[PDB]
Structure 1
Amino acid sequence: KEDNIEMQGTVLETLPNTMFRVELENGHVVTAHISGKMRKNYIRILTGDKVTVELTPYDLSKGRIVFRSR
């Protein structure tokens, strides 16, 4: 959390367990899982959207989605 990393990306394909494959503005692909409120707000994500992706410096291969472009 300290010194967080903030990026956008595009979701490419659906995975089981509501996890997702997202290409990143820098060319990298990451594995993403949903946050609580867009889970609590019943907001479902489809293929192809632009999404805001939080990253952590410990590992950049997997991130978390926090905001989807409708």
Structure 2
Amino acid sequence: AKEDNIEMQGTVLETLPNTMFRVELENGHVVTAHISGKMRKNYIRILTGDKVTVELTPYDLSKGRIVFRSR
């Protein structure tokens, strides 16, 4: 409605500790992201350079998360 979270994704540049994504965004900046928890165990597998989603907030632009497969 007003301050909602946007899907606004990237290129995986690192696959981080367990299965996370140090992603270069569509805006040109590096963000830390995880996938959305749910699909991890129907394991929809990805590596260092895959087409990730990365949803983020209005306020905190340094982070993100693979919501639904959009790129």
Q: TM-score, normalised by structure 1?
A: 0.79
Give the count of matched residue pairs. 70
Deviation at 1:56, TM superposition (A): 0.9
Once the two structures are overlaid, the 10-residue window that deviates more, 25-34 or 2-11, is 2-11
After superposition, give the CA deviation of every residue in 1:12-53 in whole Å (9 maximum; x if it has no partner): 112112222000011011001121222121122111112121
| In 1, Cα distance between equivalents of 2:6 and 2:16 | 24
Higher share in strand: 1
SS in 1 for 2:38: helix
Percent identity of the aligned residues? Answer: 100
**8 A contact 2:3–2:58 mirrored in 1:** no
Q: Tell me, which stretches of 5 or more residues in structure 1 are unaligned?
A: none
Q: Tell me, which stretches of 5 or more residues in structure 2 are unaligned?
A: none
Task: Report the aligned-residue RMSD.
Answer: 2.3
**8 A contact 1:49–1:68 mirrored in 2:** no
Runs of 4+ off more than 4 Å: none
